[PDB]
C-alpha cells in the first residue's frame, strides 16, 4: 500500500556491476539491507558526536571520512575513504 524506503535497486545494480551472473535470495538481501542501514546509523552517530564535540553544526565529508576511519579498522577503511576521495573528485 504505502511506499517504503528500500535499497533494493541500488544493491542490485552494484551486484550486477561486480557479478553479472550472480543473484541474491530475499533473506540474504534483507540481511544486506539491514547491514547498510546499521552501517549508515553507526556512521551517522559517529559523525554526530564528532560534530557535537567540536561545537560544529555542519556535517561535511570530513566527518564521514573520520567516522569511516574510526569505526572501520585496518586498510578496509582506507580504500573506502579513497573511494570517497575520488567520489568528491568526480563531484567537483
Amino acid at each position: 500500500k504505502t511506499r517504503k524506503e528500500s535499497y533494493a535497486i541500488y544493491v542490485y545494480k552494484v551486484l550486477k556491476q561486480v557479478h553479472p551472473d550472480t543473484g541474491i535470495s530475499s533473506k540474504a538481501m534483507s540481511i544486506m539491507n539491514s547491514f547498510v542501514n546499521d552501517v549508515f546509523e553507526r556512521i551517522a552517530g559517529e559523525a554526530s558526536r564528532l560534530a557535537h564535540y567540536n561545537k560544529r553544526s555542519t556535517i561535511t565529508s570530513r566527518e564521514i571520512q573520520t567516522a569511516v576511519r574510526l569505526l572501520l579498522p585496518g586498510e578496509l577503511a582506507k580504500h573506502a575513504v579513497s573511494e570517497g576521495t575520488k567520489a568528491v573528485t568526480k563531484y567537483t
Binding site: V18, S25, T60
Partner: protein
C-alpha cells in the same frame, strides 16, 4: 528548468546521494548537513556492498551456487579478518558458524 540528472551519476556512483541526504536530514544527526557528506557516505556504502557481495560470490562459486544465500554472506563476513573485526558484535540470520574443527578433536 532543465534536464534532471541525479547526483549519483555526476559522482560516478550507484548508491543514491539524495536518499542518503534525506535520511541524514530526517535522522536529526545534525542541524546542517554538507553537500559532500551524502556523496562520501554513498561511496563508502557502495564500496562495502561491492566488497561483501564479491566475497559472497567468491565463496559461492566453489559451492556450485549462482545465488547469494545467507550462509554465503555469513561465510564471506567471518572468513575476512577485517570484516570479522568490524562486524564483531553482528549476528547474521540463517548463517550459522564456520565449519572448523580443532586439531585435538580429530583423532
Amino acid at each position: 528548468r532543465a534536464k534532471a540528472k541525479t547526483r549519483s551519476s555526476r559522482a560516478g556512483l550507484q548508491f543514491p546521494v539524495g536518499r542518503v541526504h534525506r535520511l541524514l536530514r530526517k535522522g536529526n544527526y545534525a542541524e546542517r548537513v554538507g553537500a559532500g557528506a551524502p556523496v562520501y557516505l554513498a561511496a563508502v556504502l557502495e564500496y562495502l556492498t561491492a566488497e561483501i557481495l564479491e566475497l559472497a560470490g567468491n565463496a559461492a562459486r566453489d559451492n556450485k551456487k549462482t545465488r547469494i544465500i545467507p550462509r554465503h554472506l555469513q561465510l564471506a563476513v567471518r572468513n575476512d579478518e577485517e570484516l570479522n573485526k568490524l562486524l564483531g558484535r553482528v549476528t547474521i540470520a540463517q548463517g550459522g558458524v564456520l565449519p572448523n574443527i580443532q586439531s585435538v578433536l580429530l583423532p
